[PDB]
Each structure stands twice: as C-alpha cells, then as structure tokens.
Amino acid sequence: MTAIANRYEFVLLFDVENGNPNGDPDAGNMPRIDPETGHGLVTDVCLKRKIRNHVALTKEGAERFNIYIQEKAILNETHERAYTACDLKPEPKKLPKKVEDAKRVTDWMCTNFYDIRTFGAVMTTEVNCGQVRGPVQMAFARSVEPVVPQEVSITRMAVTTKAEAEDNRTMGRKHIVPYGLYVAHGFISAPLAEKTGFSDEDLTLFWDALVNMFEHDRSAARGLMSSRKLIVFKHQNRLGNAPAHKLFDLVKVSRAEGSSGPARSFADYAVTVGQAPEGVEVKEML
Amino acid sequence: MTAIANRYEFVLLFDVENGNPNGDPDAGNMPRIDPETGHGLVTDVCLKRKIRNHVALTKEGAERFNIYIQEKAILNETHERAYTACDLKPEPKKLPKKVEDAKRVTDWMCTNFYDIRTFGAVMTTEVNCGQVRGPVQMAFARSVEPVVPQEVSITRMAVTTKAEAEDNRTMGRKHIVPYGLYVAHGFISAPLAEKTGFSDEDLTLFWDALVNMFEHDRSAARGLMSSRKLIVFKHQNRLGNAPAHKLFDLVKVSRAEGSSGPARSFADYAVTVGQAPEGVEVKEML
Amino acid sequence: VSLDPARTDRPYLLGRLFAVLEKAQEDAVPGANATIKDRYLASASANPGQVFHMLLKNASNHTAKLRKDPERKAIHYEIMMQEIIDNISDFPVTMSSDEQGLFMIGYYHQRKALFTK
Amino acid sequence: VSLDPARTDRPYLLGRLFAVLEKAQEDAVPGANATIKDRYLASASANPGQVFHMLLKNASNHTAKLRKDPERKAIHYEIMMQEIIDNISDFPVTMSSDEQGLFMIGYYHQRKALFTK
C-alpha cells in the first residue's frame, strides 16, 4: 500500500442558487459572512463531512474503507477496540510505554479507518491512542463577490400544540442566498503520507468523490449546488519546485463582458488559466 | 571550522489568511496581540522551531547536522554523552576542572548539533556542560496594522465519553485572523561565530530555510501562510560600518493607491528600499 | 450630547438616511414580522452603494402609493430624504471599520429624534 | 446599587454599554458556552473604535430573536441602549491605563443594577 511520491495542489469552484450553503449556529441560522467586507464563507469541516458521506455511500463499508466518525458514536470505545486489536489495554491517560504497542494500535487504526488515513485525528482521550496530522488539508472557502442574503417568511396552516386560539397560524422563516460563487484551496504532502500509507488509489477515489460531492445531499433548505471547475498542479519531486502562492495566481476569474447587474448565473463570469512553470504539470479534471 | 568574516543584518516579510499564526497559551488559545494598540505579535521561538523542523526534514541526520533531538527528549542525557564521548566523567552541576576537556564536553556538542552551533543553549543543568550564546539572534514580529481576531462555532457527530444524557451533540471553537502582514529583524555576529565555527555553508542552508520555511507546515488551524521579501545587508569588515537602526530605516511599507478600507491581499501594500552607505552591500533579490 | 443637524460627515448622514427610511417604511406597511433594519442593517454599513440604490426604488414606489390617501407625514420624510441626499455627494463602495462605528451613532441619534412625537 | 445614572463620563458610559450588551446576549441564548466578556473584554479595552460596531450587529440579531416571543422584556433593553449612546459624540481610538480602570467600574455598577429585580 505504497504512499504517493509527488506534491500536489488544486483549486475548486462551486456555486449555489436560492439556498443556504452553511448556516453558522450563532446568528439564528444565517449564512456565514465576513463582517467587514460582506463576502460569504464556508468552513472546511462541512466539506469534509460531505466527502465522508460520499465515501460511506459509494463503498458500502468495504474493508479498510470504514469511517471512524459515525453519527452519535462513542470514540473511547473505538480506541479501546483498537487497543484490544493490538492486544493491549489503555492507560487512563497515556499510550503504552512499550513503543511497539503504541505503534501497533496506531497502525491498526490507520489501516482500518479511511478518514483517519486521510485527515488525521486527536485520539488523546482517556483511551489514549495518540495523534495524527493527516496528509490532506483544506482552507476556508471565500466568495468572489459580496453577497446580500434575503429572509423569507412562511406560515403553517395546521396547529402545533393546544392553546386558547389553537388554529392561529405560526410564522416561520427561511434564509437564502440568491446567487454566489466560491473558491477553495488544498494541499497534499508526500512525507506525511509516508507515515500512513496514503496510496494513489485513495487519491483517485478522493478526486471522484470531490467531483460528485453535491449530487447526493439534496434537501429542503440547501437549494441547488454544483461544482464547476477543478485544476490540479503536480510537482515533479517529493518536494515542491515553486511557491504555492505563485501557482494560485495562474487562475483568474472576472466579470464576463456585457454583465451589468448583479451576477445571477455562472455565465456572468469568465475564467482563465495561465502557463505553469517548467517543473509543474497542470491538468483540468473537470 | 572556518567562521564567517563579516557582520550581517536582514529583514523578513510574511503574511497570513484565515489562520492562527501562534496561539496564546493563557488567553484560551487566541492570537497574541499588543494590549495597547492591537497589533499582532509572533514569538521568535516559533520561528526557530520552524527552522529546526525544516533542517531536520531536509538533511535527515547527515553528519554534523543533528538537531539535538529536541522533540520529547531528556536533555541531560546528551550532556553526559558529551562527557562520556569526551571521555570525561559526567558532572551534574559543574563543568570539569580542566579547561580543554571542559570546553570539549561542549565542542563535541557543537560538532554534532547544528542548532546548538547556531542558537546556543543553557547547559549548566543537572548535568553541566556550560553555556553558549549563539551567533544568530532574532526579535519579535509585529504587524504593520491592527488586527481583529474572529471566533466561530462547530458541531459534532458523536461523543467522546460516556455522555448518557443523550442531533448536534457538541460545540467547538476556532480562532482566526482575516488578514495580516508581518515584519521581523535579525542579526549575525562574527566574533561569537569564531567561538563555535559557524561557517558559510551553514549560512547558505540558513538562507534556504528562511526562503522555504512555510511550505512544509500545513495544518488544520494554520491556514495559508507564505514569505514575500528578504533583504540582506553585509558589512565590509569584522565590525560593521554603520548603526543597525539606520539600515532598517531604509525599508518602508505603505498602502497602495487603492486603499479601499480593509486590506485583504499583499497587493494592497507598496514596498520600497533606499540606498545604503558606501561601506554596506545591499542584496535583496533573495 | 444628541443629534447634530450640522455634522455633515458622510457616514453620519448615511446613518441618518437609514434611520428615516426605516421610519417611513414602518408607516408604509404596518404589521410586518421583520423591519428593514433586521434585514439590511449589516449590509448597508458594509456596502453603501450596493443597497442604498436598491432601497430608494421601493421608497419611491411607496410614496407613489401613499399620495392617493389623504394622510400625510409623507411629505416631511420626502423633504428629509431630499436634504440628506443633497448633502451626500456620492455613495462609497465600502467603509473602513473604525467609519462603520460612526455610521451607528448617526443612526441612533436620528432615531431618537424620530422616536419622539 | 451604587450606579450613578448621570455621570456622563465616556469610559463609564462605555462600560455600562458593555454590561447591557452582555445581559442581552445572555438572555437571548440560554446555555451558551461563555459570555461576551470572556471573548471580547480585552479587545474592547485595547481598541474601542474597532469592536463596538461589530458588537452592535449581534445585539440587533439577539433582540430580533427575543422580541418575537412573549418575553418582550427585549424592548426595554433597546431603550437603555438609546439613552446611553445618546450621550456619546464619537468612539475613542485609545484609552489610558488610568481610563481603563474607570471603564471597569462602570461595567460593574451597571451589572449589579441589571440583576436587581
């Protein structure tokens, strides 16, 4: 299960229509924004969640593709199960003093759980199984342009609970974004992958999940979401050949000619990709 | 081993995006700030940590390039190793009463450990090999403008512990900086270098470490960080030809024409460098 | 310390304008669940030119509506808009954070005055 | 309570404002992790001019959240907000170590007053 042997970077584009992409739980449930400039934000956590979901759905629990963070699970017990699998019991706070036992519990955990093998985890709980850093990382998603969220009042004809006047109709609410366009960054590092065995087949599965992410999570509130673009830079060496910021500058997005009013469709924008330096390969997977 | 023969000064610039550069271990985990002005701060220790990391990654145990196994080691063992390696009986609190061997229980260190050769260490400890001052020093990093830390909230699938009270089962926090630009200062001294042997190849490796520091540092909380500029002043004799403060004044940073309220990119700023006196050589293209 | 009719600072004027648009809307449409304030307070302070342009459409529509009925206020409000919009040269695309503070004061100050009577 | 409702000292006013904000927030969201104090005490003192305008956004959201319910205290708070702010001409950029102390005092007096039935 050999690890990858190159350093990577990529860029992802996606948009929304008449929906809430991430309600952050500290302002009613309004969509999250930058409070000084009015651009919209989405957390990486959300994205990761989504990807976990997709992998679970597609692989159907195949061996060595289990997911560690399942709904309303208990983690300490999974730690204990790893301990027993490597045939040790935990100290209430610390990993086994025998280095090999800790290595075995950690390697067992990494081998069995796909998401641990990809993102790492903080297993420092009572049942101490250690720490992992994770080879794949992502940054915050930021909108290209300011967003103007709108709130919609709604009502319910039926009656919740008995009172003095209860058919008296309640008013509920929805919060929505009309339109918006988002950008994301990510990285992959070979040296860390060498510590966990993150193999290239996992990389292909990761690409696949990343392109088909939005298609399975339709909901009442979520509206319509889709993915538009995907660009990957491949270094020719286990250590890079150029700074990351220079690469990200090769891709530009701007108003499509003739657009006057607020953006309302993908067609109102124009996107271009520059020429990469000598030591890097540029591909468009979508 | 041949030491350098000139004094050096330099200036470094770097920025951040949606990240925590260095968490305050007392103030929850918020970014460090100036209590009076709101300017951000970064400890030098952090930087040195980073540099040591990069050196260990790139050299991988090459001879005379050990890193004092700084991670989770029992330090006093290496001192008695120096004593035993020098064939001297380990002395807990005191150096040997023999000048040559006394200094050898340190020269062994200097030969072996790069970071000791560069920064020095305290070695009067429960195994005594003495003191070192370090030919290379750095000061605190200060942002050019006030910063406004932000905080966000997190859900959770599951529960770690036996939380039998019995959805979204847990909260969590993150601390971030929308944007910021940082500056730093440093010095190198030849007379001290003569005492340890810090040589030219080490200086070149140091330059490389400074250029490529951040590339291998990606993490969940880190966000996006990179370096931007580097200017080096080289005097023409073992003792400089001008005061340091005069040199640092030749570099100036200011807002671009398009000020436009909040700064959100490097593009918002303009950087310029003056011209140095006759006795000083300025090289900035690094 | 109270409302100053002579401050003539742009973010103060924008705050006053906002406050009185709120007041006029109120009289326009009774019984609303949420006010324009609740809807747009944040946005207005972040993107002046963006929204302000938008709001005035609706305000125009409303005052158009309201002339049929004998009831008046709204001519005083139309004059108040016309004073503040004549003092404002132009609408900034965005404001410095420190300026967004001053915008809040002009709003509160103006509101209190209108709160009276 | 020792609170003096007619002091009119800017830092004192600011502290009272802070306290009221905190109380409002508290009422809005039962079972919260922590307080406003915990998150933003430092910053406020450090740079009053940069944070207050952000605090006032959340204030509004909280109030909105509240008012819809039969617990229409939250109207009572808003009036205080009106009164306090009324007296203020602009936010300070910086505060001396001395008025920082004063700032604190105001906070505390107001805090106790709110907690009174």
Q: What is the DSSP string of A102-135?
A: HHHHHHHHHHHBHHHHHH--EE-SSS--EE---S
Q: Which residue has the tokens 């929304």?
A: A16
Q: β-strands B122-124, B128-131: how paired?
A: antiparallel
B113, amino acid identity: F
Q: What tokens appear for A154 in the block?
A: 């709604």
Experimental method: cryo-EM
> Is the Cβ of B172 closer than 8 Å to some Cβ of chain D?
no
Task: Please state, in angstroms and as integers, the Cα–Cα distance from residue A41 to each residue in A23, A44, A149, B12, C43, following that order.
Answer: 10, 10, 13, 30, 15
Is residue A110 within 8 Å of A196, Cβ to Cβ? yes
B185 contact partners, CB below 8 Å, separation of at least 6: B9, B10, B11, B138, B139, B248
What is the distance in angstroms between the Cα of B166 and the nearest Cα belonging to chain A? 9
Separation of alpha carbons B175 and B3, rounded Å:
44
Nearest to A153 among C33, C47, C50 (CB): C33
Instruction: Could you list the beta-strand ranges (E) of D14-78.
Output: none
**Count of other CB atoms within 10 angstroms of residue A32:** 22
Burial degree of A164 (CB within 10 A; 0-12, 13-18, 19+):
exposed
What separation, in Å, do the N-terminal and C-terminal C-alpha atoms of chain D show?
12
Separation of alpha carbons B220 and B217, rounded Å:
10
Nearest to C1 among D53, D89, D91 (CB): D89
Torsion angle, alpha carbons of B212, B215, B217, B223, to 10: 120
Any chains having at least 3 CB pairs less than 8 A from chain A are B, C, D
B266 closest CA partner among B231, B228, B230: B228
Task: List chain D residues with CB under 8 Å of B24.
Answer: none
Report the run of H or E that residue C13 belongs to, with start and end. Answer: helix C10-28
Is residue C55 within 8 Å of C21, Cβ to Cβ? yes
Separation of alpha carbons B276 and B242, rounded Å:
10
What is the distance in angstroms between the Cα of C88 and the nearest Cα belonging to chain B? 19
Interface of B with A in 30-59 (CB under 8 A): 57
**Count of other CB atoms within 10 angstroms of residue B152:** 17
Separation of alpha carbons B156 and B86, rounded Å:
56
Separation of alpha carbons A127 and A123, rounded Å:
8
A273, amino acid identity: V
> Is the Cβ of B270 closer than 8 Å to some Cβ of chain A?
no
- Most A-contacting residue of D61, D63, D66, D67 (CB-CB within 10 A), to test interface: D61
**Cβ–Cβ gap B161/A126 under 8 Å:** yes
Any chains having at least 3 CB pairs less than 8 A from chain D are A, B, C
Task: List chain A residues with CB under 8 Å of C94.
Answer: 37
Q: Which residue has the tokens 């610039």?
A: B13
Task: List chain A residues with CB under 8 Å of D64.
Answer: 28
B216, amino acid identity: H
Chains A & C: contacts with CB separation below 8 Å: 24
Separation of alpha carbons B24 and B37, rounded Å:
17
B157, amino acid identity: M
The chain D residue lying nearest A172, using CA atoms, is: D68
